[PDB]
């Protein structure tokens, strides 16, 4: 019967103020909750606890920007001057006391996005497949693409200069640590298609521009 | 100050397997101990909890009586006794701290329970091409399940360091990348090593990387 409310996802311009809404329900109006923030490849960090009353202690760590607000059962999570490293999953959590029982509901998280950003081309490295894959008698081609914003990127693949789509499995774009996008691409060829052909190429586009690579037997 | 995790791995539904929590930075008996897991698709959810004295203990409906918690106060861990595991217990599992608040988390361990078998990686070096600044790096491809870990030198190397999240392939499988970005004069004074670690499979490589 406890439930913890939230949106799924918004998006703010950067340098704007943000708020992110959790909801309780009517029967527990009164509750006190807390916020987590959920970054990639990281433990979620505990932002601040909130109390009914309107008083908050902020957690070790978190930036002077972090506010929090109570308003019936709404409670807020405001974030004035939004900066790039903002961008993570908001969970709201709630906790109760039924019998001696401990109850502790998380919400469903809220995807915060930052837009405004400056626009970055991606980096891209190729690598031919190794000598050592060769003898197994396998053949990948590893596209490495990262350092691109916003992350939205298209990987097109050839052989001499005419377009591969047969063996290739490509990498949703994740945030780096540094708030950039990475992505990944893979051909799977076998050694004789990847001897027979002069050479073979990763081509990524990004906001209407193209990075290429070249890769060749030898 | 920090938390750390360990016992997590793959295992066939039905059977048991036993997760550790190793503290540091504070003190023992300040907190109780928490297990917070959040499963593939859905949020976080409460697992069970133990007092700073073991004097109560607390255990989610979902996993009523198939789960054992207790606390250690000599070496500062916590412990997690899953048996009768369900695919459903399926998810990354972390511990935490609390005194009101869960105010400090752990990295977090993936379990898995699953009838899937275990494969182990074959690992090869991604070689530098023939200036100024080169690429060189690992393939650590065709895995289940995760997680992999990659280092290099035996951790001695971290600058430039970047491993790829894995792509999950249409066989079911995992492949993932991990490259490091050096300058072109390294390449004759440093010994280049990609550490491969996958505790499924029992799969544990350090392979040379050379041009």
Redesign the interface.
């Given at each position: 019967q406890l439930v913890l409310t939230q949106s799924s996802s918004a998006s703010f311009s950067l340098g704007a103020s943000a708020k992110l809404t959790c909801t309780l329900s009517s029967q527990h109006s009164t509750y006190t909750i807390?916020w987590?923030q959920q970054q990639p490849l990281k433990?979620?960090?505990?932002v601040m606890?909130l109390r009914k009353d309107g008083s908050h202690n902020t957690?070790?760590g978190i930036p002077d920007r972090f506010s929090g607000s109570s308003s019936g059962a709404d409670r807020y999570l405001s974030i004035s001057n939004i900066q790039p490293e903002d961008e993570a999953i908001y969970?709201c959590?709630v906790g109760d006391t039924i019998k001696?029982?401990?109850?502790?509901?998380?919400?469903?998280?809220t995807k915060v996005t930052v837009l405004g950003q400056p626009k970055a081309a991606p980096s891209v490295?190729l690598?031919?497949p190794?000598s050592?894959?060769l003898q197994?008698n396998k053949a990948?081609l590893?596209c490495?693409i990262?350092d691109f914003y916003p992350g939205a990127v298209t990987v097109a693949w050839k052989a001499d200069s005419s377009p591969v789509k047969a063996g290739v499995?490509?990498?949703?774009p994740?945030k780096?640590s540094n708030n950039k996008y990475?992505?990944?691409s893979?051909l799977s060829l076998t050694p004789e298609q990847w001897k027979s052909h002069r050479s073979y190429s990763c081509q990524v586009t990004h906001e209407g521009s193209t990075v290429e690579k070249t890769?060749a037997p030898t | 100050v920090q938390?750390v995790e360990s016992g997590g791995g793959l295992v066939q539904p039905g059977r048991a397997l036993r997760l550790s929590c190793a503290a540091s930075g504070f003190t023992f008996d300040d907190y109780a101990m928490h297990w917070?897991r959040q499963a593939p698709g859905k949020?976080?959810?409460?697992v069970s909890?133990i007092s700073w004295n073991s004097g109560?203990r607390?255990y989610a409906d979902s996993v009523k009586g198939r789960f054992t918690i207790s606390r250690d106060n000599a070496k500062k861990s916590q412990y997690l006794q899953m048996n009768s595991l369900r695919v459903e217990d399926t998810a990354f599992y972390?511990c935490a701290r609390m005194n009101?608040?869960?105010?400090?988390?752990?990295?977090?361990t993936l379990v898995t329970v699953s009838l899937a078998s275990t494969k182990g990686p074959?690992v090869?070096?991604?070689?530098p091409?023939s200036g100024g600044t080169a690429?060189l790096?690992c393939?650590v491809?065709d895995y289940f399940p995760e997680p992999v870990t990659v280092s290099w030198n035996s951790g001695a190397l971290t600058s430039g360091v970047?491993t790829?999240?894995?792509?999950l392939?249409?066989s079911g499988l995992y492949?993932?990348?991990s490259?490091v970005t050096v300058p072109s004069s390294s390449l004759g004074t440093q010994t280049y090593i990609c550490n491969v670690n996958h505790k499924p499979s029992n799969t544990k490589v350090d392979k040379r990387v050379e041009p």
């Open positions: 807390e987590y433990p979620p960090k505990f606890e957690g070790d969970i959590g001696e029982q401990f109850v502790y509901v998380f919400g469903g998280g490295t690598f031919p190794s050592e894959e197994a990948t590893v490495l990262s499995e490509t990498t949703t994740s780096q990475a992505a990944s893979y890769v | 938390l917070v949020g976080l959810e409460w909890g109560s607390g972390y009101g608040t869960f105010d400090y988390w752990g990295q977090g074959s090869f070096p991604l070689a091409s690429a790096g393939l491809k970047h790829f999240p894995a792509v392939q249409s492949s993932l990348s490259v």
